[PDB]
Amino acid sequence: MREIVHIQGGQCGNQIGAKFWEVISDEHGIDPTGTYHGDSDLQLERINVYYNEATGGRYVPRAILMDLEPGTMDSVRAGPFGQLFRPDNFVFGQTGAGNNWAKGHYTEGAELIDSVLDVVRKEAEGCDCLQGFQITHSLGGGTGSGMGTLLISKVREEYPDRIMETFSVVPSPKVSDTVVEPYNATLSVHQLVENADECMVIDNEALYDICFRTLKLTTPTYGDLNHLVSAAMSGVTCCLRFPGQLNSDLRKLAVNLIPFPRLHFFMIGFAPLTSRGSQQYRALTVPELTQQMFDAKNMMCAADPRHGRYLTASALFRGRMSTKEVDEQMLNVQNKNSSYFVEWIPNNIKSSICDIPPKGLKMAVTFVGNSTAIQEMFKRVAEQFTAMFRRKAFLHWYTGEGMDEMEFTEAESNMNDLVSEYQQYQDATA
Amino acid sequence: MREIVHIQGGQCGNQIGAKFWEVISDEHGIDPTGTYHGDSDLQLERINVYYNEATGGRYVPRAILMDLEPGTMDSVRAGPFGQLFRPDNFVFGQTGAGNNWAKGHYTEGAELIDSVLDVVRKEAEGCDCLQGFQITHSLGGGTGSGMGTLLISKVREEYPDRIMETFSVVPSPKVSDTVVEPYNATLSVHQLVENADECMVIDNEALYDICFRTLKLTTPTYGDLNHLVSAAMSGVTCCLRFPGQLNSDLRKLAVNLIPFPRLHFFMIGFAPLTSRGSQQYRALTVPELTQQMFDAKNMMCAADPRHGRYLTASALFRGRMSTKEVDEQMLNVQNKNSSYFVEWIPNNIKSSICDIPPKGLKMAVTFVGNSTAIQEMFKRVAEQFTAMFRRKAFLHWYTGEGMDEMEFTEAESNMNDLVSEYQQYQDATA
Amino acid sequence: AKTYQGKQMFPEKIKALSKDLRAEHFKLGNDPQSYTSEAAAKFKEFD
Amino acid sequence: EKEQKELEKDILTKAVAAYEQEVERKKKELYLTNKQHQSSLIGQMHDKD
Amino acid sequence: TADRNKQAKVFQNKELAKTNFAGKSSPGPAYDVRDTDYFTYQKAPKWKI
Amino acid sequence: MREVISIHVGQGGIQVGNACWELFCLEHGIQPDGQMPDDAFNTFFSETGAGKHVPRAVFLDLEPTVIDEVRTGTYRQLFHPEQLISGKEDAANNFARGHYTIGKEIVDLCLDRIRKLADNCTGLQGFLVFNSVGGGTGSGLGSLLLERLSVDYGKKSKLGFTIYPSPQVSTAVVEPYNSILSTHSLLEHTDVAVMLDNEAIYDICRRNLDIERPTYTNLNRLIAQVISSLTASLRFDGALNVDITEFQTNLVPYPRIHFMLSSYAPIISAEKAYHEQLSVAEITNSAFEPANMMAKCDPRHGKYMACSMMYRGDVVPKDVNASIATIKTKRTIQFVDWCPTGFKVGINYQPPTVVPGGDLAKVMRAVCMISNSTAIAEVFSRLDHKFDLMYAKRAFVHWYVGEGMEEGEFSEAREDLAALEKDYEEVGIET
Amino acid sequence: MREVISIHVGQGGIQVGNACWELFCLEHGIQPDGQMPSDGDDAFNTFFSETGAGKHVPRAVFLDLEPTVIDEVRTGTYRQLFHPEQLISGKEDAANNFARGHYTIGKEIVDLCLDRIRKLADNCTGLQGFLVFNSVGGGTGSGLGSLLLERLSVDYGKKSKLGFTIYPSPQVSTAVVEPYNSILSTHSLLEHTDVAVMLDNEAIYDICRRNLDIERPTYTNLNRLIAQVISSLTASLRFDGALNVDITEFQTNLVPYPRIHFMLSSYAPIISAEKAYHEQLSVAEITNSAFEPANMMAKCDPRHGKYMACSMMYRGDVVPKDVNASIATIKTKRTIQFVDWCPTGFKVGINYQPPTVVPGGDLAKVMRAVCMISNSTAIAEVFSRLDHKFDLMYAKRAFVHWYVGEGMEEGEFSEAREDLAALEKDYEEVGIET
Ligand SMILES: Nc1nc2c(ncn2[C@@H]2O[C@H](COP(=O)(O)OP(=O)(O)OP(=O)(O)O)[C@@H](O)[C@H]2O)c(=O)[nH]1
Ligand SMILES: Nc1nc2c(ncn2[C@@H]2O[C@H](COP(=O)(O)OP(=O)(O)OP(=O)(O)O)[C@@H](O)[C@H]2O)c(=O)[nH]1
Ligand SMILES: Nc1nc2c(ncn2[C@@H]2O[C@H](COP(=O)(O)OP(=O)(O)O)[C@@H](O)[C@H]2O)c(=O)[nH]1
Ligand SMILES: Nc1nc2c(ncn2[C@@H]2O[C@H](COP(=O)(O)OP(=O)(O)O)[C@@H](O)[C@H]2O)c(=O)[nH]1
Ligand SMILES: [Mg+2]
Ligand SMILES: [Mg+2]
């Protein structure tokens, strides 16, 4: 029941998806051949949320992989747990968007999306009671942002009442590798805000920073960044698959974190994280978790919440713990730092307890917070975008296939509208 | 009882028939020497439908192999299972028609067809109570469409109350092997509508697409294409040879499919069809079967069923299953796609169940659907026909063998009148 | 002719590099856990 | 039904594994067919020379 | 919502070589290569009286 | 039980006729003596009852050197002794001699030999006739024989393999004369004519075969290969068989238009044969290349009426269909408006054979095409212009008139070419 | 399923093509006769084409109007590799005359060459673009190259073309008329090539002498460097990498405007075995040698102008996190300055295949290397000095009678000068600040 399908798009998205299914399968005890070898009966009770049952009793994930380049599949297929995916679900072209939003949205995505949208119907129609969709993609690449945002429109257009999530990676100027990142990122966020129910921003800059500061490992790699995101992804829907004191599905979090319909851009963080040098020195307690929960450096974004005011906060506790400690700690944090919390919404922190902790850690926490500090990331992207656009630089490739300048200007104003509107509540008082 | 006789003509028909008998023989466990070596008692209960008993305890198919050249007949005799056919039933000329409809219907048609009716009359009278006839042939060739269509006319005038079936292969525009295809295809349709009780159209283009995309096999061949069609022919009469929950012989299909006497052109398909490397990820269930069964890609014709509306449809199921599960699927598919089903005829899907699955599978379905979208093929064939006929190209051969151009005018109008009368019900409303 | 001659030159490193860059290198806390629910531990059958 | 469901597991894995050899065998013999057929030209090259 | 055509565009295997070599064919037989053996051989001498 | 009889008249036909018979004998394993060391040889040969086989062919000529060359060669024991018709006085490049003076006393024996062969056959498919058109007995006897066979047998199919003069390379000076007079005979008496001028075959040998000094021995081997590919479906089983009667019913839109030109592929020497793969997709591209046309004509100057290509080897039905659709995509190749589909395709299993001492490299795939195009109107125009120059001052006329031919026979022959050309121009214009 | 076709025209193009094809054969492990040794596939499909059994055929065609260099290839150790009919040779050389190779002789070879190009392109399914090599200072190089580009443009359309031209050096020169045929060739290629690379000979001499410690460099040494550059540029198509970059991801990241597609190259490390192992050659330091001005492969100083964009490729065992720190350090450095309307100006690619070492060569074996391709406003100086040279020559109409009598009109030289002046104005107005 309330099962959800998985869609990953682009080269960056597939890497997230490949590691995510490795994390979930280990949690549910599914071998790379898809045969269940678990120990407890709870591991199979709610396995229909993410998996489908085929002939012979094996389990196959309900994930749809898309791209515009055939190089992507042979790396993910040849990797560990690459045999779980149904070969019929691979849909992608042969040319590639070339880090161009227009190509991935106008001239090639349109011709191909009819095929991928079919298997989306096949997966969604087979569900007895669909809960929602989740999309993984990056906002710095062409096909990831291009086809990725266009699916958001058509999926929403056919399933309006369902819930929608996007784990989007935005480009940061500190670590940037493509000169047209400001262009395609600006256009995507225009279409994303109209359709996505919940959006989550993840930064490579913060992921590199958290690895250097907390984990203190000498050389991070794309495996580490993928795993940190995948750990937080499973925590969001953990209580949906396992019992707990206060179960809280996807819809419940959406209601309690969105005061107004256009404010649905969250930043997430995970705890506890510690280097194995100090792993045996730390003491795992509920007060210990919440201190690292609200740490500014622990956030998966470079937007500092201390530069703004929290609107709403959500905490999902995992493990065997008491309710009184959970309730009292949120109250104490909300009182010790009352300056950082907007005042006309009293007690604006939500809590949930699931008593099946992640493997390895006795207790763990995922944090989802809506704060006014995220506006500065849209601003700094806009500053770069408006700098290049005034001189018409790198433009004839976007305008060479039907796109025109009014689309860029229209995206500029609406994005500027969103940020100006988003800081309205930062200074608003009762 | 209620047995049928098989008549095959032309190079295409003989290859279709040769593989069809091999499929039936394995189904009933009949060795190529005519000795029964089956395992189930049911395999011998209804063997008189297709086989005639002979002295020594061997069975001989009641097939009339007819042609104008000995080249294709010598090949089918040298192949496996070629010793089943009685040598008397091989009737063939020496000169051949050669893609000339006039030659195969007027010059060499009249002088040789006296012999074939002689053996047909012998076979038809011998049986206890005849059920009907079935003919496999190609409309793109001379002898197959020329003498084949005269054979039907002579038989129909002698057996007016019997069932007549033809499995017709029409020439598609994408794949063409003869330059004179439009002429001999148009003339046969004029004669085919007046006499045939049921007509089924097959495409070489559609069969190639199915093998390349669905079966995912690198080396298709005419042996493989004939395999798909052979399974379809065995499916329609499966419940006539074996018991089941709902028995529905060939005549019962006619009543529930043809609303008006001139609308008897069906398009068929078979399921499940899957690649041999991806059959371990699928699940064989009734809901999964009906999705592939109603898919436009699975259909054995180039016409798109979603471009028109279904008048009536019929599905035959083989294997063990629950009737409630089948009935709800027909109801559910009708409600979800009410736009594609004509409204002034409620409950326009017929379901039948037989409890003998095909060898090597646990479930199978056969789909026969009278859809208004089949008018596309008559449109494209006429468009090619009217292009050639305006310049009188390739016409001196037909007028050179006792035919006149007036017959072309009658054929063109009657075929055109078929399309107009057939499109009328597409937009008909209550 | 003197410069270009027939030269003797002679994927494991590629695979080793590829697997490492998707690897963990840092694992997580070590697992002492056994699955048990909160509603099943408190409510037990009594004599 | 639990056993027959498991009884379909070993049948399927053997049938799929068996299918692999025909894919490999056809490729192996095709190379041999071309290898000997190419070597016929070297005979033709010498005869022409 | 996908017809029979415009679906083969999706990549399937290395078997698309049998159907995709000549989309960018640089059309066909547009150039001439007739009697271009003047370069590989030596032309016959032509003599004035 | 299917038979074809081949007629070889003149020196040009006989020497091409010889090269056909090393290939036919080699395919079926028949030794030059004629004794084998199932019934596939029945198309060309005939069992003698015990042992040897004799060809179903007759050689006609008036000049003994070429015939006596055959009767003393390595094939002296193959042909029937009294089916090699040899004369005494050569026609000597004169059409009037071979049609009015010599041919009146020659055909009677010739039709007797044809009758004896025909009565032996039971399923006679048709006749094949070989003759160079720019010669005396080549056209003089060929015109007479075709006219006589048109009334003796009637509806039988006659295929003509002629060798028209090259645009600028020739060995005779009066050949523009006897070529035109022959056209008026074979236009109304031959079901299928093939364009096989010599200059185009020189270019193929120089470019593809890497031969710098081609000879008449080399050319006839190429022509022999085309004959084998054309009739390969009659004696070898295949996936798609095409009979002899399935050429006129598919390549002749109107009775007047029956002139087609052929191409063959691949033709590559062993030095660079398998330095490339020779896929089925590329061999069909080489067939349509204008340089590979066996006749000196440019298909790019006109539309295509109909196309018939025969595949032999290990091809499969998937790949021809993919290749044909590619050709229709091409813009440089344009078909006539009233013919949407114009390809007739046949597939055979027997690969082409290799003759010892030859030049062609052995391959597992081959294709031979007979194409009907409006571009063939050029060859008639250029020969018509040559005839106009000489006939302006009545040169060489006194030779023809003295041999019983009327003065005005040239005038009625010239008008036929003008009538023929206007037919091609009329057909090509779109509606 | 991705392919690319390489065109070699002129003696210099053929000479560099020989070296690059030797390098590719060594890298993919194919013997010079074409046969695979002894007995992981499709790594060669980018450059080669399987014959169906054993040997391979390169996707290249060799052009020249003089057989002196071509016949060497047909006789040398690589006589069994190339297809015999794709090494196309003429009979009379252009003799340093652009008019001869563009109006008199070049029009007899171009049809056959395009037929060969069709016969090569119809056998490929994923052609990313064309690679064309030519030396600009020669007659047939400039003439046939320009005609080839002009015909390929109309015959193909949007297919990318990459030209690795070799402009004459500022003061070091071989011929005396080579300023003349450079102007016309530049005018022809400006509106017909998509990406052009500047590879003048004088700079490569300095790089060799300073790094490889060669006191007498020869044309053989220079060609190896260009071959290594091509291998680094194209390895991302045919080898597995962490952050792949295709050919089409150049014309979306390197050329801000359609008329500005002239760009420089730099390679590092270039070092001999005698001092290769005295340092660790970390990625932090090799990226500094890439931006070192004297290491640029073209005789142009980036310090005299702004930087537009920089697309630079790594190969070896480089880690993505290490690249970012070096890029941040470079951006922090003040001596290198970018245009204001380009906040982010780096495109980085990472590949796993280390640079293969040629036996008997000069370079040592190193675990890491970087190839840098930059676009900058500093390239304006190379045209200005060539413009001055051409003006000095054309002031009193010298050597012109050798061009007028071969079909070129008198006024052709005037139009090319206007094109060069407009191009310089375009760079100046692009480089000006807002
Ligand atoms: N293809 C081919 N053509 C030939 C051959 N020998 C002669 N010809 C052609 O025949 C033409 C002239 O005819 P001839 O071969 O001299 O003999 P003919 O046609 O029988 O006429 P007569 O001289 O009267 O015997 C020449 O223009 C040649 O083109 C040959 O061996 N092969
Ligand atoms: N990098 C490099 N450049 C060369 C080489 N050989 C010649 N060049 C350049 O080529 C220019 C002159 O052209 P050539 O290579 O001699 O020959 P071409 O370009 O075909 O012109 P033609 O001599 O008329 O045939 C000179 O200015 C050189 O800069 C070489 O081996 N390596
Ligand atoms: N977390 C993570 N990010 C990646 C990975 N590979 C690439 N990226 C990011 O994705 C961005 C480039 O996106 P791209 O691959 O072009 O997206 P695409 O156009 O959809 O293929 C870069 O800025 C990288 O930071 C990975 O394996 N893991
Ligand atoms: N399904 C199928 N079709 C075939 C086969 N062989 C030929 N055809 C089709 O039949 C057409 C030719 O018809 P033909 O054999 O001449 O018909 P006939 O004249 O009656 O013998 C071709 O276009 C093929 O597409 C076969 O084995 N199976
Ligand atoms: Mg003679
Ligand atoms: Mg030179």
CSV table of C-alpha atoms in Angstrom, one decimal, chain G residues 22-198:
chain,number,residue,atom,x,y,z
G,22,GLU,CA,51.0,5.3,-35.0
G,23,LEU,CA,50.1,6.6,-31.6
G,24,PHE,CA,46.5,5.3,-31.9
G,25,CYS,CA,47.6,1.9,-33.1
G,26,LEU,CA,50.0,1.6,-30.2
G,27,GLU,CA,47.3,2.7,-27.7
G,28,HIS,CA,44.7,0.3,-29.0
G,29,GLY,CA,47.2,-2.6,-29.3
G,30,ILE,CA,46.9,-3.3,-33.0
G,31,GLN,CA,50.0,-4.5,-34.9
G,32,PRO,CA,51.1,-2.3,-37.8
G,33,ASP,CA,49.8,-5.0,-40.3
G,34,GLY,CA,46.4,-4.4,-38.8
G,35,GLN,CA,46.0,-7.9,-37.2
G,36,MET,CA,45.1,-8.1,-33.5
G,37,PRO,CA,47.8,-9.9,-31.5
G,38,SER,CA,47.6,-13.3,-29.8
G,39,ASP,CA,43.8,-13.8,-30.2
G,40,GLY,CA,36.9,-5.1,-23.5
G,41,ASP,CA,35.7,-4.2,-27.0
G,42,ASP,CA,34.5,-1.3,-29.1
G,43,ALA,CA,37.3,0.9,-27.6
G,44,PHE,CA,38.7,1.1,-31.2
G,45,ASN,CA,35.3,1.8,-32.9
G,46,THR,CA,35.8,5.6,-32.6
G,47,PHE,CA,38.8,5.5,-35.0
G,48,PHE,CA,38.8,2.1,-36.7
G,49,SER,CA,36.4,-0.2,-38.5
G,50,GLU,CA,36.3,-4.0,-38.2
G,51,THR,CA,36.6,-6.0,-41.4
G,52,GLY,CA,34.5,-8.8,-39.8
G,53,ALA,CA,37.5,-11.2,-39.3
G,54,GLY,CA,40.7,-10.0,-37.7
G,55,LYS,CA,42.3,-6.9,-39.1
G,56,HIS,CA,41.1,-3.3,-38.9
G,57,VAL,CA,41.0,-0.3,-41.2
G,58,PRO,CA,41.5,3.3,-40.0
G,59,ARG,CA,38.8,5.9,-40.7
G,60,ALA,CA,41.1,8.2,-42.5
G,61,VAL,CA,41.9,9.5,-46.0
G,62,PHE,CA,45.3,10.9,-47.2
G,63,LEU,CA,45.4,13.7,-49.8
G,64,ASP,CA,48.2,15.3,-51.7
G,65,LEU,CA,48.9,16.5,-55.2
G,66,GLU,CA,52.5,15.2,-55.1
G,67,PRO,CA,53.3,11.4,-54.6
G,68,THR,CA,56.6,11.9,-52.9
G,69,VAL,CA,55.2,11.6,-49.4
G,70,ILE,CA,52.2,9.4,-50.2
G,71,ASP,CA,54.2,6.6,-51.9
G,72,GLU,CA,56.4,6.5,-48.8
G,73,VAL,CA,53.3,5.4,-46.8
G,74,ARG,CA,52.4,2.7,-49.3
G,75,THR,CA,55.9,1.3,-49.0
G,76,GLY,CA,56.7,1.6,-45.3
G,77,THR,CA,55.9,-0.7,-42.4
G,78,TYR,CA,52.3,0.4,-42.4
G,79,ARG,CA,51.6,-0.7,-46.0
G,80,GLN,CA,49.1,-3.3,-44.8
G,81,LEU,CA,47.1,-1.0,-42.6
G,82,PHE,CA,45.5,1.7,-44.8
G,83,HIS,CA,43.1,0.7,-47.6
G,84,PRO,CA,44.9,1.0,-50.9
G,85,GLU,CA,42.4,3.4,-52.5
G,86,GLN,CA,42.1,5.9,-49.7
G,87,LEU,CA,45.7,7.3,-50.1
G,88,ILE,CA,44.8,9.7,-52.8
G,89,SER,CA,47.7,11.2,-54.8
G,90,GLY,CA,48.0,13.7,-57.7
G,91,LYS,CA,50.6,14.3,-60.3
G,92,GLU,CA,51.6,18.0,-60.2
G,93,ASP,CA,52.1,19.9,-56.9
G,94,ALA,CA,50.5,23.3,-56.3
G,95,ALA,CA,54.0,24.7,-55.8
G,96,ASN,CA,53.1,27.1,-52.9
G,97,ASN,CA,50.4,28.6,-55.1
G,98,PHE,CA,47.0,29.0,-53.6
G,99,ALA,CA,45.4,29.8,-56.9
G,100,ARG,CA,46.7,26.5,-58.4
G,101,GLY,CA,45.3,24.4,-55.6
G,102,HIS,CA,41.9,26.2,-55.6
G,103,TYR,CA,41.1,26.9,-59.2
G,104,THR,CA,43.3,24.8,-61.6
G,105,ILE,CA,44.3,21.5,-60.1
G,106,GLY,CA,42.3,21.2,-56.9
G,107,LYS,CA,39.0,20.9,-58.8
G,108,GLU,CA,40.1,17.6,-60.4
G,109,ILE,CA,40.7,15.8,-57.0
G,110,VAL,CA,37.8,17.1,-54.9
G,111,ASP,CA,35.2,15.0,-56.6
G,112,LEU,CA,37.1,11.8,-56.0
G,113,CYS,CA,37.9,12.8,-52.4
G,114,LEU,CA,34.3,13.5,-51.6
G,115,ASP,CA,33.3,10.1,-53.1
G,116,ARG,CA,35.8,8.6,-50.7
G,117,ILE,CA,34.4,10.6,-47.8
G,118,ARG,CA,30.9,9.3,-48.7
G,119,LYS,CA,32.2,5.8,-48.8
G,120,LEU,CA,33.7,6.3,-45.3
G,121,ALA,CA,30.8,8.1,-43.8
G,122,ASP,CA,28.0,5.7,-45.0
G,123,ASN,CA,29.7,3.0,-42.9
G,124,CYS,CA,29.4,4.9,-39.6
G,125,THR,CA,26.4,5.5,-37.4
G,126,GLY,CA,27.4,8.0,-34.6
G,127,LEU,CA,29.8,10.4,-36.3
G,128,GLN,CA,30.5,13.2,-33.9
G,129,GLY,CA,32.3,15.3,-36.5
G,130,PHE,CA,35.2,15.6,-38.8
G,131,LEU,CA,38.9,16.2,-38.0
G,132,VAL,CA,40.9,18.0,-40.7
G,133,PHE,CA,44.6,18.6,-40.6
G,134,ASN,CA,46.5,21.0,-42.8
G,135,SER,CA,49.5,23.3,-42.9
G,136,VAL,CA,48.3,26.8,-44.0
G,137,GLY,CA,51.5,28.1,-45.5
G,138,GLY,CA,51.5,25.7,-48.5
G,139,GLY,CA,49.5,25.8,-51.7
G,140,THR,CA,47.7,22.5,-51.7
G,141,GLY,CA,47.2,22.7,-48.0
G,142,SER,CA,45.5,26.0,-48.2
G,143,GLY,CA,43.7,25.4,-51.5
G,144,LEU,CA,42.5,21.8,-51.2
G,145,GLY,CA,41.7,22.4,-47.5
G,146,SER,CA,39.5,25.4,-48.3
G,147,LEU,CA,37.8,23.6,-51.2
G,148,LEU,CA,37.2,20.5,-49.0
G,149,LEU,CA,35.7,22.6,-46.2
G,150,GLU,CA,33.5,24.5,-48.7
G,151,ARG,CA,32.2,21.3,-50.2
G,152,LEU,CA,31.7,19.5,-46.9
G,153,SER,CA,29.7,22.3,-45.4
G,154,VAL,CA,27.1,22.3,-48.2
G,155,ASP,CA,27.1,18.5,-48.4
G,156,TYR,CA,26.7,17.8,-44.7
G,157,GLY,CA,25.2,20.8,-42.8
G,158,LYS,CA,25.5,20.8,-39.0
G,159,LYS,CA,28.3,18.2,-38.6
G,160,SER,CA,31.1,19.6,-36.5
G,161,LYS,CA,34.5,20.2,-38.1
G,162,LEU,CA,37.8,20.6,-36.2
G,163,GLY,CA,40.8,22.2,-37.9
G,164,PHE,CA,44.3,21.9,-36.4
G,165,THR,CA,45.9,24.5,-38.6
G,166,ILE,CA,49.6,25.5,-38.4
G,167,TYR,CA,50.1,29.3,-39.0
G,168,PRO,CA,53.5,30.6,-40.0
G,169,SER,CA,55.7,31.7,-37.1
G,170,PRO,CA,56.1,35.5,-36.4
G,171,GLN,CA,59.8,35.7,-37.6
G,172,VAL,CA,60.9,32.1,-38.3
G,173,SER,CA,59.6,31.1,-41.8
G,174,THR,CA,60.3,28.6,-44.5
G,175,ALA,CA,58.8,30.1,-47.7
G,176,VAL,CA,58.5,33.7,-48.8
G,177,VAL,CA,55.0,33.9,-50.3
G,178,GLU,CA,53.3,32.2,-47.4
G,179,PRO,CA,51.9,35.4,-46.0
G,180,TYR,CA,49.8,35.7,-49.2
G,181,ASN,CA,48.1,32.3,-49.1
G,182,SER,CA,47.4,32.5,-45.3
G,183,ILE,CA,45.0,35.5,-45.7
G,184,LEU,CA,42.8,33.8,-48.3
G,185,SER,CA,42.8,30.5,-46.4
G,186,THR,CA,41.9,32.2,-43.2
G,187,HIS,CA,39.0,34.1,-44.9
G,188,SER,CA,37.8,30.8,-46.4
G,189,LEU,CA,38.0,28.8,-43.1
G,190,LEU,CA,36.5,31.6,-40.9
G,191,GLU,CA,32.9,31.0,-42.0
G,192,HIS,CA,33.3,27.3,-42.7
G,193,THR,CA,35.0,25.7,-39.7
G,194,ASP,CA,33.5,25.3,-36.2
G,195,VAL,CA,36.6,25.0,-34.0
G,196,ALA,CA,40.1,26.0,-35.0
G,197,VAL,CA,43.4,25.4,-33.1
G,198,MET,CA,46.6,27.4,-33.5
